[PDB]
Design brief:
The structure is a homodimer. Chain A is α+β, with helices and mostly antiparallel strands. In chain A, about 35% of the residues lie in helices and about 15% in strands. Chain A has 20 helices and 24 strands. In chain A, strands 2, 13, 14, 15, 18, 21, 22, 23 and 24 form a 9-stranded mixed β-sheet that branches. Chain A has a 7-stranded antiparallel β-sheet with strand order 1-5-6-7-12-9-10. At the A-B interface, helix 1 and helix 5 of A face helix 11 and helix 12 of B. The complex binds zinc ion (2 copies).
C-alpha cells in the first residue's frame, strides 16, 4: 500500500487520540436507532444521545422524548473515520484490527437494518432506517435535516468500500450504498412534485456521484440520476457566472454542494462510458457549469468571505462580501446563542479542504495547495484539544474567547468528562474525520509527479513510482526542509514556493547543486528524483500582518504558514462555555482578556507601527521572534511585540493551532 | 497486587518444593566467581560447582582446574526464580522475606562486582564478571557459550526489577542490566568484525528488549541497539518466508531467539516513542519479519517436530520434519552419551511455553492457550520429582527408560543426595524458574477480558476489574469446572472449548442458564461476569491415540489434557543413570521394560484395535478407564488395555506427569 507514516510529534499525537476516541464506540449503541426503526432487536442498548438521540425516551440516554436530533449523521461520520483510520498509519496493528472489526459490525448492522426495513416498508426499500422515512425531506417530529443525516451514512459506506481491509465488508457497503441511491430515485418518483433541495442535504450529490463511481456498470445510470437530483444548478449557474450570491446562505450547507459539482465532473470524465452517455451539451456543462461553479465559489469565498485562519462564516452563514470584521465583532458578546463567538464553524474548513483537494486534483493549480496547507494548520489542526483529542464547533475571531471543544459521550476521556452524555455536533463528526485522515493530503501522486502539498516530517512509500520519500520539516521553527529518496523507480517531485516564505531567501539544493526555482504553468518547481536523491529546500519564514478588508485596524499576525495567537488569560474548560443552537457549546467572553488585545504604538501611528514589522521577525521589528530555532519543538515558537504600551507588551504570541489552555487573540485591535 | 493462589494439591507441592530449594542457596557462594573475576574478596567461599565451577581449582568443590563450565548461567536463573518466588503465592511470608533478602544480596553483589570490574578493565565496563571477558563470544579455557551464560544474568536482573519488593534492589538491577546493555554495544564497537551469533547466546535479544522496556528514555535507543545485535535476521527471514530450516539446528539455542523476535515486536508496539523511532520499513517488518517468523516457527515446530507431550528435539537438536519415531528409537539404547533417551530436553519446553505465551498476548489466538495447557502439564509439570522437587534434562519417548532428575548440590534433599556436588544443568536452571513462576499463566487479563488459559483450582484476585474469581477444576479426573465470582467490577471471562474434550458433551451453564458455545474470532467463548456470577463448565475428557507422522505403530494415549504412561518396571534413582555431554545425567535403558510395551491385539489387526478405542474410555473400549471419578485426586487416574496379549494386559496406565518411580512407556509399539 501507499502509505504516509507521519513523524511529526504533534500530528502523531493528534492522530493517536482520534484512533483512541474511535475505538471507544460500541457498535451496538451506534446501531440502535437503525435496528429500532427496522423493527429489529436493539439488544437493550442506548443510543449515544445528543444529536444521535432518536424519538424514543427509552433508547435516549437523556430520557428525552422526540428531541431535536440529527439521527445517523455522526454514525455516518464514524463509519467514514473508522474506515479512514483502519487504512492510515496512526493506529497500531492491534488498534486497526479492533477498529476494523467494529467498522465491520456497524456496516453489516446498517445493511441488515436496511434489508429488514425494505421488507417492512417496500415503497422505501433501500432507505437507511436512521429515522422515519415519513419526515423526508424537510424533517419532522424533532428530526432535523433528514437528507443531511442520510448523506453521512451514504458517504460513510463509500469510505468503507474504499478502505475496509475486509472484502465482505466492502461488498456490503457497496450494496448498501447502491441500494440507497435506488431508494432516492424511487422516492423522488413517488414524490415527483416535492422539492428536495430546500432543506440542507449536506454533500448528498457528492456522495451519490462517489457511489456511481464504485457501482456495477448496470447500476451506474440509476445512481447518477439519484446524484443529479441533488445538484443545485441554479446556485451553480450563478457561481459559474461569477456572481457572489452567498450573503445569507448557510455556509456549511453550501460548501459541500460545490464539492459535489466537482464529483460530477470527476465521475463523468474518469469513465468514458459515463461521459459517452451524456449529450454533448451536458458534456460541455461539466466544465462551463460544474467545474466553473466550484472554481468561482472557491475564489469568491477565499477573497471575500475568509478569516486569517482559512475559515469562513458567522452564525453558520455567509454574510456580505468583505465584511469579516463586522460579522466577528458587531454581533454581541453575551453568553449563549450564536453571537460574535460564532465565527468559523469547523465543518466548513473540512469541506473547504475537500473542495481545495478535488480542485487541486483536477487542475494541479498550486494555489489550492497553498490554501490547503494554510487551512489544514490554522483551522483544522487548530480545532483539536491535544490532551483530550476533542474538537471545536466555532472558532472565535474576536479577541478574548477560549477555544471550546466537544466531549466524548463515551468512556474515552472519562478523566476529563466523567459520565457526561455526548452531544455529537456536526463539527465533532467532521472532526473525527479530520484526524482519522490527517495524513491523506501530504502528497498527491499522478503518473510522473509527486506533489508535496504540505511540509511535514514523514515517510511516503510511493508504491506507484517505487520510491520511499522521507521528508524532514519543522517549518517555521527551523527553515530547512529535507527530502531523501530510496527505491528503484523515478519521478518528478513538485514543490510549491510558498507565499509565506521570504522569496529572496528561498533556496533549492539538489544533490549538492543549487537549482533554479523555475515554476511550471501551475506554479510548481520540478525536481527529478530517484534512488539516492537528496534535497535541501530552504524556506525562511515571513512574518506578516493581515487585516480585514473592512477594517485596517483589525490585524492578525502570521509567521510562515502558522497564524499566531496571544495568550490572554487562563480558562476553565468546565465552565467557560454556554449553549446555542441544538446542544452546541459556545465560548463565554472574557472582557478583561479582550482589553489586553489593544496594540498601542509607543511612538508613531498605527500605520508606522505596522510598517516596522520586519518580515524576518528580527530585533528592531515591532513584532520579534523570541524562541531559539535550535531549542524545543515547533510549538515553542514564540514572539513578542515591541514599542507597544499596555498589557500587549507583556503578552507572548505562539501558534494559534497549539493554543488551547487560555483565551486568545488572533486578530488584534490597533490603537492610534 | 493481582494474585493467583493455587488450591491444586499437586501444583502446591510442586511450587513449595521449589521455594525450599531456592532458599538452600547461600548468596556468598552464588557470588564467588563474580567477586573473584572482579578482584573482590570471595570470603573464602566455594562456588556451587558443576556447570557453575569457575577456572580455579581452589573455588571449585570438585577441585578441577578450568573444567567445561557455564559460570553464571544458573546464578542468573536463580535470580529469575528467586524474583518470581518472592512475588508469587507458594512461599510463606517468612520464606518470602528471606528469599527477598537473599535476592537483594545477590543483585547488589553482582552490581558491586560489575562496578569493581569496570575499574579493573575499563574497556569492558558493564560486563558481568562471571568469567573472563576475553573468551567472549565463542568461549575458551573451558568457559562455554559466554553470551548464553550472561543472558541468564541479564534476564535475571529484569525479573528482579519487575518483582523485587525492595526499591533499592529494583533500581540496582535496572542499572546493572542497562550497563550490561551499554557494554554489549561498546564491546561490539571495539570488535566490529567479530560475529556474535555463531555460538549459542540464549535469548539475549529477548532479554535486551526487556531491558529496553524498563530503561530510562535517554537509554532506550542504546539498549535497543544491543538487543538488535542479537537479532538473527537470516533465520527469521527463512521462517517468515515459511521455510523449515530447523534440521540440524540446536533446538534450545533456536527457540528463545523467536521469543526475542516477539519481544522486539512488543517493545516497539507498546511505546509510541520507540514505535515512532522506526523507519516505515522497519515498522512493517515488526509484522512481516519478526511476528511472522515467530508465528511460523511455532507452527512448524508443533506440526513437524513435536512429540505427544508438547516437547521437541533429540540429542538437543531438531532433525527431519516428521521423523519423530526415527529420532527417538534409531539412535541407540547403550548407556551414556546422547542416544535414544536424549529426546525432549526440558529447557526447550520452558522456552516453547514462553513463546506461546507472548504469541497469545499479542494475537489472543486460542491455539497458543491449547498448546500452553498441553505442554505445561505434559512436559513441565511432568519434569519434576514431587518428593525431591528436582527436574529432568531429557524425557525419553522410547519406552523402557526411567525419569532421571538432577540433584540439589546443596543441603536441601540431603536425605536423598547426601553431600554430592551439584551439576546445575541448563534444564535445572529453567526448571527452578518453571516451578517458581508456576502460577504466572493460569489467566491472562486485558482491558475487558479475563482469559482462562488453564483449568486449575485457584483463586484469582483480579485487581484490574475488581473481581475475585475462584476456579474449581479437577479435569480430567472429573469433568465439571466451576467458577464463582465476587467483587464490585465486571469483565468478560473467555473460555476455550478444548480439542481434548468430547465436543458434543461440552456444556456451559451461567447463573443457572445454559449458554451457547459461540466462539469469538480467536476461538474463545465469552461470559459476562460480575459479583455473584456462577459458571459450571462441563468438559468431558476424550481418550485418543496419537501416533508419529513416521510410524503409525508408535502410539501414545491421552485422556483430556493428560498424556498417559504405563508403569513398566521399578527403577532405582541411585543407579539408573549414566552421563553425557557436560555432567548431564542420562537414563539407562531397561530392555525388559521395553518389551512389556509391546501391544499385540487379541482379536483384529492393529488398525481395528485402534478403532476400538472409545473417546469416553468406557467398557467396550480397547483402552478403558478403571479409576472411579469420585474417589481419589487427579493422580489416581488409571486405565487398562483390553483385548491385548502379553504383559500389556497387566500394565496400568496413569498420568505421565506424575509417573516417576518406575520406567515408563508413553509411546507403545503396536504389533500386528
Ligand atoms: Zn459543524
Ligand atoms: Zn536444558
Amino acid at each position: 500500500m501507499e502509505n504516509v507514516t507521519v513523524a511529526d510529534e504533534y500530528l502523531q499525537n493528534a492522530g493517536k487520540k482520534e484512533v483512541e476516541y474511535l475505538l471507544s464506540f460500541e457498535p451496538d449503541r451506534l446501531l440502535v436507532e437503525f435496528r429500532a426503526q427496522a423493527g429489529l432487536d436493539t439488544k437493550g442498548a442506548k443510543n449515544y444521545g445528543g444529536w444521535e438521540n432518536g424519538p424514543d425516551e427509552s433508547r435516549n440516554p437523556d430520557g428525552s422524548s422526540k428531541p431535536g436530533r440529527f439521527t445517523g449523521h455522526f454514525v455516518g461520520h464514524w463509519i467514514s473515520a473508522a474506515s479512514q483510520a483502519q487504512r492510515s498509519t496512526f493506529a497500531t496493528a492491534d488498534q486497526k484490527a479492533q477498529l476494523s472489526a467494529n467498522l465491520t459490525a456497524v456496516v453489516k448492522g446498517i445493511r441488515e437494518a436496511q434489508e429488514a426495513y425494505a421488507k417492512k416498508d417496500t415503497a422505501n426499500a433501500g432507505f437507511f432506517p436512521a429515522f422515519s422515512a415519513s419526515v423526508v425531506p424537510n424533517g419532522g417530529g424533532g428530526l432535523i435535516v433528514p437528507f443531511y443525516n442520510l448523506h453521512k451514512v451514504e458517504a460513510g459506506m463509500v469510505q468503507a468500500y474504499d478502505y475496509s481491509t475486509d472484502a465482505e465488508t466492502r461488498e456490503t457497503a457497496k450494496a448498501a450504498a447502491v441500494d440507497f441511491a435506488k431508494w432516492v430515485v424511487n422516492w423522488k418518483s413517488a414524490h415527483a412534485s416535492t422539492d428536495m433541495l430546500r432543506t440542507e442535504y449536506g454533500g448528498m450529490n457528492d456522495a451519490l456521484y462517489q457511489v456511481a463511481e464504485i457501482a456495477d456498470a448496470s447500476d451506474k445510470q440509476t445512481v447518477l440520476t439519484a446524484a443529479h437530483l441533488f445538484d443545485e444548478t441554479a446556485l451553480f449557474q450563478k457561481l459559474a457566472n461569477g456572481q457572489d450570491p452567498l450573503n445569507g446562505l448557510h455556509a456549511n450547507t453550501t460548501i459541500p454542494k460545490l464539492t459535489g459539482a466537482m464529483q460530477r465532473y470527476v465521475a463523468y470524465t474518469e469513465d468514458e462510458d459515463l461521459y459517452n452517455s451524456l449529450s454533448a451539451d451536458e458534456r460541455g456543462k461539466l466544465t462551463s457549469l460544474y467545474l466553473k461553479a466550484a472554481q468561482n465559489f472557491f475564489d469568491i469565498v477565499v477573497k471575500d468571505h475568509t478569516y486569517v485562519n482559512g475559515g469562513n462564516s458567522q452564525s453558520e452563514h455567509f454574510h456580505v462580501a468583505g465584511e469579516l470584521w463586522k460579522d466577528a465583532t458587531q454581533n454581541g458578546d453575551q453568553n449563549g446563542g450564536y453571537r460574535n463567538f460564532s465565527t468559523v464553524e469547523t465543518c466548513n474548513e473540512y469541506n473547504m479542504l475537500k473542495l481545495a483537494r478535488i480542485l487541486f486534483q483536477v487542475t494541479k493549480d498550486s494555489k489550492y495547495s497553498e490554501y490547503y496547507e494554510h487551512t489544514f494548520i490554522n483551522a483544522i489542526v487548530a480545532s483539536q484539544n491535544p490532551e483530550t483529542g476533542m474538537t471545536t464547533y466555532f472558532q472565535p475571531m474576536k479577541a478574548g474567547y477560549p477555544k471550546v471543544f466537544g466531549i466524548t459521550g463515551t468512556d474515552y476521556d472519562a478523566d476529563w468528562f466523567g459520565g457526561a452524555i455526548g452531544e455529537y455536533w456536526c463539527c465533532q463528526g467532521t472532526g473525527i474525520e479530520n484526524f482519522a485522515k490527517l495524513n491523506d493530503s501530504f502528497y498527491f501522486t499522478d503518473e510522473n509527479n509527486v506533489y508535496v502539498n504540505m511540509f511535514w516530517s514523514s515517510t511516503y512509500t510511493d508504491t506507484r513510482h517505487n520510491l520511499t520519500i522521507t521528508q524532514t520539516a519543522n517549518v517555521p521553527k527551523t527553515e530547512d526542509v529535507t527530502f531523501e529518496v530510496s527505491g528503484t523507480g523515478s519521478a518528478n517531485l513538485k514543490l510549491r514556493v510558498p507565499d509565506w516564505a521570504i522569496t529572496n531567501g528561498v533556496k533549492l539544493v539538489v544533490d549538492g547543486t543549487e537549482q533554479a526555482l523555475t515554476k511550471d504553468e501551475n506554479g510548481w518547481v520540478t525536481v527529478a528524483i530517484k534512488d539516492g536523491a537528496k534535497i535541501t529546500y530552504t524556506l525562511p519564514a515571513k512574518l506578516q500582518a493581515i487585516d480585514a478588508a473592512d477594517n485596517k485596524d483589525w490585524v492578525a499576525f502570521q509567521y510562515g504558514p502558522v497564524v499566531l495567537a496571544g495568550a490572554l488569560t487562563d480558562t476553565n474548560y468546565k465552565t467557560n462555555y454556554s449553549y446555542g443552537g441544538v446542544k452546541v457549546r459556545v465560548a463565554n467572553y472574557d472582557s478583561e482578556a479582550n482589553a489586553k488585545a489593544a496594540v498601542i504604538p509607543t511612538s508613531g501611528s498605527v500605520t508606522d507601527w505596522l510598517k516596522g514589522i520586519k518580515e524576518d521577525a528580527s530585533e528592531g521589528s515591532n513584532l520579534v521572534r523570541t524562541d531559539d530555532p535550535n531549542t524545543g519543538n515547533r510549538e515553542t515558537l514564540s514572539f513578542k511585540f515591541a514599542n507597544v504600551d499596555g498589557d500587549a507588551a507583556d503578552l507572548t504570541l505562539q501558534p494559534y493551532y497549539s493554543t488551547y489552555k487560555t483565551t486568545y487573540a488572533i486578530y488584534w485591535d490597533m490603537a492610534e
